[PDB]
Design a protein around this ligand. Structure first.
Ligand SMILES: *[C@@H]1O[C@H](CO)[C@@H](O)[C@H](O)[C@H]1NC(C)=O
Length: 208
């Protein structure tokens, strides 16, 4: 007798989510049932990560239903790269009127895929007198490991480490980028692509 229950989001193929990289310390994941509960009914939600039920007793995870229970949001705080990947949201009937049988209704689970990128940028001073170009390798997002930046350029100068500490236990705002390294060119023949590589990611600047 009870109304049907399915998810509008995520769909069967899952939902990708990525954070606001200007405010990277937390992200909100939301799932929604396709229809609101009828009068006298409520939905109940469960969230899982790594096979494991999440609840509000967890420090970095906070779950909140909508007023009508049609949706549920998980806020992950203290975000770091290792939080990336799949999260599962499951909806079921939580309350049903007496004399309605909800026990035949199967819970519905969706998958959210949380993408936590690491972006590299190579910025230039321009040619300046301190004779010289200074390139700075900067990152933002979610550093994966402690791998130092590696500079490259086909063929081929001072490399000064800038920030050398660990960033993989947290995140870096796109409007508070971290400088990892600087390539100084002392002194036409130096024109061309210079690349900074930080683990799997890279960016270039063409010095002309
Ligand atoms: C989930 O599993 C991965 C792989 O073992 C791990 O890096 C991560 O810390 C685990 N915990 C969370 C909350 O993502």
């Amino acid at each position: 007798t009870p109304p049907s229950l399915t998810l509008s989001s995520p769909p069967p193929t899952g939902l990708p989510v990525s954070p606001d990289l200007s405010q990277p310390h937390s992200v909100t994941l939301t799932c929604s049932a396709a229809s609101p509960p009828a009068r006298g009914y409520q939905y109940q939600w469960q969230w899982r990560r790594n096979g494991t039920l999440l609840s509000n007793t967890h420090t970095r995870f906070s779950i909140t239903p909508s007023t009508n229970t049609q949706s549920s949001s998980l806020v992950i705080s203290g975000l770091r790269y290792s939080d990336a990947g799949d999260y599962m949201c499951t909806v079921e009937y939580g309350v049903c009127p007496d004399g309605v049988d909800c026990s035949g209704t199967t819970p519905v689970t969706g998958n959210i895929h949380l993408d936590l990128p690491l972006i590299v940028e190579v910025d230039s001073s321009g040619l300046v007198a301190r004779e010289v170009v200074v390139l700075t390798c900067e990152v933002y997002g979610y550093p994966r490991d402690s791998s130092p930046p590696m500079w490259s350029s086909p063929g081929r100068f001072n490399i000064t480490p800038r920030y050398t500490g660990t960033l993989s236990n947290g995140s870096v705002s796109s409007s508070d980028k971290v400088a990892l390294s600087q390539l100084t060119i002392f002194n036409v023949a130096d024109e061309g692509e210079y690349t900074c590589s930080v683990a799997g990611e890279s960016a270039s600047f063409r010095v002309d």
